Design a protein around this ligand. Structure first.
Ligand code: CDL
Ligand code: PC1
Ligand code: PC1
Ligand code: SF4
Ligand code: SF4
Ligand code: SF4
Ligand code: SF4
Ligand code: FES
Ligand code: K
Ligand code: ZN
Lengths: 115, 96, 103, 129, 115, 176, 263, 205, 209, 95
């Protein structure tokens, strides 16, 4: 039952190799992206954001899911490197317009009914 | 008919009017609130009751296929006038 | 100006038509088909109607079939005028577009 | 048999990260897995044959301009259909939603006798047909 | 045969100056490949049956235009290409081994509709 | 059956070869095309002098929406909400309540004309010929809000366009 | 043990003695058409819409009232069964008013739905129709009795559930009228439930009159707090407003009824 | 045609431009004129006829060189045959009704809906819930002006379709633009886009 | 076939297509799981997802088939099934004037083998499936989004994706660019419950549970 | 239509076709815009007898798909008989 067709990785050790390789490519590419897209952020800010995205999923332990996340990341790399994206797409990771939303009970209580 | 509120705003045939403290009446500043002056409740009441000689009458609203679905109205109660559920026309049975 | 590679990027007119259709009735979904190949409107309707009739296991009446074919072939003329006269315009022949769009 | 060369994964299935759903609409949403009640205004029972999944209701407010009903809940009209409770629970679990299961209420079999309407010594005798 | 065709009518398909010889070579090749396939396999029993039909018609009819009518495969060049395709398929079947039993039965309600 | 669109071979006699050479050197066929454009120059143009001249239309034309009345002046609409249910675009919003005289009438009847596809399903569904797509097509606005129609707007359009609307229905109601 | 064996379209089902053809068809998933039968009311056998053919028998039997007999094969989709349904529906709709647009039962009417599934697509009735007086039985129930199909569900509910014997039939034939004869109010702690059982728009809710349509309402399953019985209910909401309260069936509490206060 | 068919400039821009072989056109999924310009004898109105296309006579134009010029000639000749079909449809138009006389699917006439109870019920239900369609799945295709247009329609038994996949001829034709544009200049690619006949409401959906 | 309103039946095709289904099942037992022919005469072959290339190649190249054209390749989301995604191949045979549907299945994480080697038309169709449903086709020339916006996260055509999505776009003058924000609708989409409580088609009645 | 005789010759000669016979601008040969009222026919099912819907119900004649096979010396066959070669048009074989 648990026997399942793999995507690329046969174990988490082989998958975590692809995660690290992907982080390398992203880390090289932020300096060019800031220059090419003419963004008003720093290279450190972009490299921090890459770290944040890689940290969000820091809990997964399924080799197949990690492969898909790596596949999706690599696609976003082809888009950004080849300038298929635009300045609006690259800057959507930073959520500049979204004013900070309350994250404490009292603040949520004063504004609305949401959990 | 169109009656005006103490603020001056026209009241609609649905009874809608903005109360004194409502900010939404600012949308009418420099423009107008569009209200139809022909209130269908008043115009139907003007139509005379029809005197008929049967316990049951049919109404299609006029025009045949250009009216409303045909219905039959019972006129066996003499304390009221049979009314159509579509066109609002009233009928009464004429004492034989 | 010699083309080494062509990468057609589409989806700039993707409008979630197929998902919207699942929230509509069969009749409600028909106008979506006029707005697909919006140059062959009645032809697209006919394909959808044929599919639904086949599932319903009904048959359209004869006169309707003849009307469909008539307006299907009028629709073909409409499409082939646009295809021919915008192929020519892109190539520089502006005039025929005006002559045939009056038809 | 299948000769693709397979791997063993003993982890539970969790696909939350690869579904594109914002975090707020996973952690804080409560799913309801139920068999819809029959509309008491009609006697048909064909809308009680399949399980459904719904989500918690959230705020709807009046549009200032026209008074329409405005919402910020993307999962407001999302209703899923399942053949079984197990299938529904599996789908919720893999998508990381918290769920509450309510068991099917089946009409109880009953005793129906037209003769009892005309009983000789019982209270089931009807006074009108 | 007769006067050679100027054109098959299909773009990218070239007239064959030796149609009968080429067909005999290919059909015979297919039968040799089918020999390696296990005997009871239905691909061998069916592919032999149709191919030996086609081979008999080539040997019987000298004229090309009469052969095309009997083979019902279009122009003779269309038939020759189909022979090459079957030969390619035959070689692939030997590695796939589709005559073997079903790898796995589907889940319980995989093909049930309506759900 | 099929036909070949471009499978003809040329004639190689000297007269034919010479004629083609003249076509190549003296541009006969190109000159031929110039004649067609010259003929069109002396034809009457197909242009109409809008807005003083209008393009032809039919009674079935689907245009600006209107709410109609019976000859008495009573609203035809009974709040059945069939138009709301069939609208492929969810452009119609209806709320109803019993009128002071007990009639089933609407308190809200809103059409978002920027959601409408002008399909006419709502005038097919209506059982009392209350909602109609009228003849008008000249109701462009300077703002979006002016295209969110409420009940009063739709009734004024009916009272504005009733004479034309009724006549068109008289012409086409036998086909419907 | 004591179970007998019957066949529904050839498929065997074991049913306790005393079971009806109807109840047997349920155990194979088939719902016989119905207008007068209600599982929580007494059997009446008057609408004649449940008629079903028994193989090797020349007369159709009312499934709602006929007990099954061992060996019977019940033909629910036979031509005789289908033609009986079409005839009955034709009689039901002959004098029915053309009121669906103005009738609050539209979209949740069994006459509409069962006409579509088990009836014809057209009428051959070229005559006039019956019209009936309206009867005031209180401020909670609206009576448009021209829509009544004389199923006597209201009469049975009041007698057999509410314990009030104020509803009955006056007259005979086509002129038979359900009502109170006198001017009376059917006021009771369970009065509103006649609205639900009435399969047509003859009995409707006055408070809910004209406000909504069935398809545009979202159904929320909640509980009643007006009392301590904890009656299970459905809250129909449209556009962030509460439109009506309907019962939700719970066998061990409220069955399929609620009190007027809850409603 | 006087302005284009024999014009040396038009022929120069379209002849031997976008040559697609018959074999590749099939595997790449082409249809319609794209196939018929390469010499493939295929028109769904003649092979899988629908409606009353088997009671009308018309000829299918076929190309020989597989180029933009042949596809131009096929489309222009297809216009002539449509006029040929229109003449037959005009003279053989039969009398009778125009929608199936089964009011559980098709709406009744407004006169009946306002006079008959069954008609009104069907009108009410057809315009609110709609007709229920038996469960199933069909791929139905036609010879649209742009090629083969098809729908994969799935029914769950309800009045609302479960899945509807739209097969547009331009979706496959556009994917072949790279193959069709090899060894060509920028202006040639402009022509190859036109010969394919692309509307992006069907390519995107 | 004298009933005016009822679709005529063609038994000759039903017998022909049924036999060809037996033909395929006999030749490809290793992958074929089910063969069915419909009332309106369409043949469907249902296969294990590991026989996509073998089965498609056989149908394309076998001399008693010659399905050279891939008319369409799509997917259907059925959440209740543990393998929620049904992959459908519709093929056309010009030689025999016939159509065949091939069906297989997969789940969110299990890849399917790309059919590009068999039909070069499948390149874009497979990209659309990935973009819209999230199914991964292994050994694809270039698998990437084709219909969705750049950076779009999610697979819209899954039954669990909201119709109006999770984000919406507008132009913000402060940042002088188009920005994405969570979706708020002035008028919420109105969900209409249209299904009737009364069964319509007895022949498809599902056996009681 | 209003063109002088000289202009008709000039444009006819330049084009090469009698353009006045087949003008592209509609004049008085079109149909009147006000037409007599219609009276349309009725369908085959507008009958008062022998018109039971159970005999003309296409939806209910649809059956579930036949299952030819399920995991739960024949001659070879083709999906259908091989297609017939088309014949050249006798109206105009070559354009
Ligand atoms: C190069 C040669 C140029 C001189 C052309 C003179 C001329 O009258 O040609 C038009 C005149 C009308 O030709 P047409 O195509 O049949 O006109 C269509 C209807 O007949 C015409 O039907 P109609 O009812 O319209 O005719 C009445 C029309 C009357 O229009 C005219 O009278 C045309 C006057 C042109 C001078 O009424 C108007 O519209 C007059 C308004 C003013 C028109 C603008 C004229 C500007 C001319 C340049 C001014 C230079 C300073 O030509 C001829 O009749 C045959 C000769 C062809 C021209 C060769 C001249 C030798
Ligand atoms: C008699 C005593 C001895 C003296 C003898 C003197 C020589 C006399 C005989 C020489 C013949 C020369 C013929 C003319 C020149 C040929 C030009 C040529 O090469 O054509 C081939 C070219 C090429 O035609 P092609 O289609 O064959 O191109 C391919 C060429 N091959 C196949 C050979 C590779 O044709 C063109 O020039 C087309 C031009 C397109 C633009 C046309 C625009 C429209 C113009 C219309 C109006 C023209 C009138 C202008 C009048 C101006 C008034 C001021
Ligand atoms: C306002 C102004 C009104 C008056 C305008 C004057 C007339 C303008 C040109 C009209 C065009 C008519 C078209 C035509 O008759 O050509 C048909 C024909 C069509 O030819 P074709 O290409 O269709 O084939 C016929 C020729 N053979 C048999 C050889 C194949 O063209 C000609 O024959 C005209 C040839 C004239 C060549 C002119 C180019 C030389 C220029 C030298 C410098 C001066
Ligand atoms: S015309 Fe069509 S889209 Fe517009 S309001 Fe009427 S039903 Fe809706
Ligand atoms: S269909 Fe006609 S009567 Fe019914 S709500 Fe709409 S406009 Fe009013
Ligand atoms: S009770 Fe039913 S059939 Fe009768 S008018 Fe009301 S909705 Fe129509
Ligand atoms: S009023 Fe309603 S419940 Fe009472 S008999 Fe008539 S239809 Fe039946
Ligand atoms: S349900 Fe049996 S007669 Fe009414
Ligand atoms: K009721
Ligand atoms: Zn009236």
């Amino acid at each position: 039952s648990t026997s399942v067709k793999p995507i690329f990785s046969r174990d988490m050790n082989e998958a975590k190799r692809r995660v690290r390789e992907l982080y390398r490519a992203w880390y090289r590419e932020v300096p060019n992206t800031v220059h090419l897209f003419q963004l008003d952020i720093s290279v450190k800010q972009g490299r921090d954001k890459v770290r944040e995205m890689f940290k969000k999923n820091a809990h997964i332990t399924d080799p197949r899911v990690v492969d898909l996340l790596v596949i999706k990341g690599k696609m976003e790399l082809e888009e950004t490197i080849k300038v298929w994206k635009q300045r609006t797409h690259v800057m959507r990771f930073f959520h500049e317009t979204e004013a900070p939303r309350p994250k404490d009970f009292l603040s949520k209580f004063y504004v609305g009914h949401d959990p | 008919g169109v009656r005006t509120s103490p603020t001056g705003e026209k009241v609609t045939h649905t009874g809608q009017v903005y109360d004194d403290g409502d900010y939404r009446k600012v949308r009418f500043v420099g423009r107008q609130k569009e209200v139809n002056e022909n209130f269908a409740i008043d115009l139907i009441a003007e139509q005379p009751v029809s005197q008929v000689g049967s316990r049951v009458i049919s109404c299609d609203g006029g025009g045949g296929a250009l009216g409303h679905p045909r219905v039959y109205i019972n006129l066996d109660k003499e304390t009221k006038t049979g009314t159509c559920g579509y066109c609002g026309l009233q009928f009464r049975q004429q004492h034989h | 100006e010699m083309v080494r590679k062509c990468d057609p990027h589409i989806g700039l007119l993707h409008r979630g038509t197929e998902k919207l259709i699942e929230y509509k009735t069969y009749l409600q979904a028909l106008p979506y088909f006029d707005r697909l190949d919006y140059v062959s409107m009645m032809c697209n309707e006919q394909a959808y109607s044929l599919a639904v009739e086949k599932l319903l296991n009904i048959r359209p009446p004869p006169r309707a079939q003849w009307i469909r074919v008539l307006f299907g072939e009028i629709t073909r003329l409409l499409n082939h005028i646009m295809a021919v006269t915008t192929h020519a315009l892109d190539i520089g022949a502006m005039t025929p577009f005006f002559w045939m769009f009056e038809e | 048999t299948r000769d693709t060369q397979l791997i063993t994964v003993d982890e539970k299935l969790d696909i939350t990260t690869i579904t594109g759903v914002p975090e707020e609409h996973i952690k804080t949403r409560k799913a309801r897995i139920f068999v819809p009640a029959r509309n008491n205004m009609q006697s048909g029972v064909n809308n009680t044959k399949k399980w459904k999944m719904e989500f918690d209701t959230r705020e709807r407010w009046e549009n200032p301009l026209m008074g329409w009903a405005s919402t910020a809940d993307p999962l407001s009209n999302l209703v899923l259909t399942f053949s079984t409770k197990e299938d529904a629970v599996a789908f919720a679990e893999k998508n990381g939603w918290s769920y509450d299961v309510e068991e099917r209420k089946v009409p109880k079999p009953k005793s129906k006798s037209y003769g009892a309407n005309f009983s000789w010594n019982k209270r089931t005798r009807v006074s009108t047909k | 045969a007769g006067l050679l065709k100027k054109t098959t009518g299909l773009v990218g398909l070239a007239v064959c100056e030796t149609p009968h010889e080429r067909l005999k070579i290919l059909y015979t090749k297919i039968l040799d490949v089918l020999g390696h396939i296990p005997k009871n396999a239905a691909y061998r029993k069916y592919t032999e049956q149709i191919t030996n039909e086609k081979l008999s018609m080539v040997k019987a009819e000298p004229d090309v235009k009469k052969l095309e009518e009997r083979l019902q495969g279009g122009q003779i060049e269309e038939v020759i290409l189909q022979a090459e395709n079957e030969l390619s398929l035959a070689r692939k079947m030997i590695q796939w081994k589709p005559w073997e039993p079903l790898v796995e039965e589907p889940p319980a309600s995989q093909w049930k509709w309506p759900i | 059956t099929y036909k070949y669109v471009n499978l003809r071979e040329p004639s190689m006699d000297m007269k034919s070869v010479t004629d083609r050479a003249a076509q190549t050197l003296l541009w006969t066929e190109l000159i031929r095309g110039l004649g067609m454009t010259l003929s069109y120059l002396f034809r009457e143009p197909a242009t109409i002098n809008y807005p003083f001249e209008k393009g032809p239309l039919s009674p079935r034309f689907r245009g600006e929406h209107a709410l109609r009345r019976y000859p008495s002046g009573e609203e035809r609409c009974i709040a059945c909400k069939l138009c709301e249910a069939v609208c492929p675009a969810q452009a119609i919003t209806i709320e109803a309540e019993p009128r002071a005289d007990g009639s089933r009438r609407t308190t809200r009847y809103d059409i978002d004309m920027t959601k409408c596809i002008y399909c006419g399903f709502c005038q097919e569904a209506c059982p009392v010929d209350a909602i109609v797509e009228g003849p008008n097509f000249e109701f462009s606005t300077e703002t979006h809000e002016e295209l969110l129609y409420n009940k009063e707007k739709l009734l004024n359009n009916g009272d504005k366009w009733e004479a034309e609307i009724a006549a068109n229905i008289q012409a086409d109601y036998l086909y419907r | 043990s004591n179970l007998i064996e019957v066949f529904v379209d050839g498929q065997s089902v074991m049913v306790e003695p005393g079971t009806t053809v109807l109840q047997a068809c349920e155990k194979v998933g088939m719902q016989i058409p119905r207008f007068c039968y209600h599982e929580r009311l007494s059997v009446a056998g008057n609408c004649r819409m449940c008629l079903v053919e028994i193989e090797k028998a020349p007369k159709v039997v009312a499934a709602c009232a006929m007990p099954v007999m061992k060996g019977w094969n019940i033909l629910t989709n036979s031509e005789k069964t289908k033609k009986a349904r079409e005839g009955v529906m034709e009689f039901l709709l002959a004098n029915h008013p053309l009121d669906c647009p103005i009738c609050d039962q539209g979209g949740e009417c069994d006459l509409q739905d069962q006409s579509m599934m088990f009836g014809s697509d057209r009428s051959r009735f070229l005559e006039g129709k019956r019209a009936v007086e309206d009867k005031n039985i209180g401020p909670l129930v609206k009576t448009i009795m021209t829509r009544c199909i004389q199923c006597t569900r209201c009469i049975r509910f009041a007698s057999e559930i509410a314990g009030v014997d104020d509803l009955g039939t006056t007259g005979r034939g086509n002129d038979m009228q359900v009502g109170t004869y006198i001017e009376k109010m059917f006021m009771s702690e369970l009065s509103g439930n006649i609205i639900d059982i009435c399969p047509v728009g003859a009995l409707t809710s006055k408070p809910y009159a004209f406000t909504a349509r069935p398809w545009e309402t979202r159904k929320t399953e909640s509980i009643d707090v007006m009392d301590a019985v904890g009656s299970n209910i459905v809250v129909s909401t449209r556009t962030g407003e509460v439109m009506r309260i309907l019962p939700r069936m719970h066998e061990d509490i409220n069955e399929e009824w609620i009190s007027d206060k809850t409603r | 045609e006087e302005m284009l068919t024999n014009n040396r400039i038009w022929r120069n821009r379209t002849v031997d431009i976008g040559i697609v072989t018959a074999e590749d056109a099939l595997n790449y999924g082409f249809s319609g004129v794209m196939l018929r310009g390469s010499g493939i004898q295929w028109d769904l109105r003649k092979t899988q006829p629908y409606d009353v296309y088997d009671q009308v006579e018309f000829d299918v134009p076929i190309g020989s060189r597989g180029d933009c010029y042949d596809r131009y000639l096929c489309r222009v000749e297809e216009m002539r045959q449509s006029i040929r079909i229109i003449s037959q449809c005009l003279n053989k138009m039969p009398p009778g009704e125009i929608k199936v006389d089964d009011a559980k699917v098709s709406p009744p006439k407004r006169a009946e809906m306002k006079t008959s109870m069954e008609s009104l019920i069907h009108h009410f239900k057809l315009y609110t819930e709609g007709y229920q369609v038996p469960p199933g799945a069909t791929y139905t295709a036609i010879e649209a002006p742009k090629g083969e247009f098809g729908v994969y329609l799935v029914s769950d038994g309800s009045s609302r379709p479960y899945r509807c996949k739209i097969k547009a001829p331009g979706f496959a034709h556009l994917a072949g633009l790279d193959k069709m544009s090899k060894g060509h200049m920028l202006a040639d690619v402009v022509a190859i886009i036109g010969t394919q006949d692309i509307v992006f409401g069907e390519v995107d959906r | 076939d004298t009933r005016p309103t009822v679709r005529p039946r063609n038994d000759v095709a039903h017998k022909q297509l049924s036999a060809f289904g037996e033909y395929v099942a006999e030749i490809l037992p290793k992958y074929v799981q089910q063969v069915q022919v419909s009332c309106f005469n369409e043949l469907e072959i249902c296969i294990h997802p590991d026989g996509v290339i073998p089965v498609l190649t056989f149908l394309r190249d076998h001399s008693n088939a010659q399905f050279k054209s891939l008319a369409d390749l799509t997917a259907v989301d059925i959440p209740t099934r543990q393998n929620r995604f049904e992959i459908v191949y519709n093929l056309l045979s010009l030689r025999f004037n016939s159509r065949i549907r091939v069906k297989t299945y997969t789940d969110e994480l299990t890849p399917i083998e790309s059919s590009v080697p068999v039909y070069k038309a499948a390149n874009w169709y497979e990209r659309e499936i990935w973009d819209m449903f999230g199914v991964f086709f292994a050994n694809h020339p270039d698998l990437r989004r084709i219909l969705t916006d750049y950076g779009f996260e999610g697979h819209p055509f899954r039954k669990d994706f909201p119709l109006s999505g999770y984000v919406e776009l507008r132009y913000d003058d402060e940042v002088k660019r188009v920005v994405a924000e969570p979706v708020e609708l002035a008028q919420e989409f109105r969900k209409f419950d249209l299904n009737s409580p009364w069964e319509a088609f007895p022949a498809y009645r599902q056996p009681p549970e | 239509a209003s063109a002088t005789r000289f202009i008709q010759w000039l444009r006819n000669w330049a084009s090469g076709r009698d353009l006045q016979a087949k003008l592209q601008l509609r004049y008085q040969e079109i149909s009147k815009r006000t037409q007599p009222p219609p009276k349309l026919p009725v369908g085959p099912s507008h009958k008062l007898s022998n018109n039971y819907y159970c005999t003309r119900d296409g939806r209910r004649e649809a059956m579930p798909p036949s299952i030819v096979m399920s995991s739960q010396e024949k001659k070879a066959v083709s999906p259908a008989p091989p297609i017939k070669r088309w014949e050249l048009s006798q109206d105009e074989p070559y354009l």
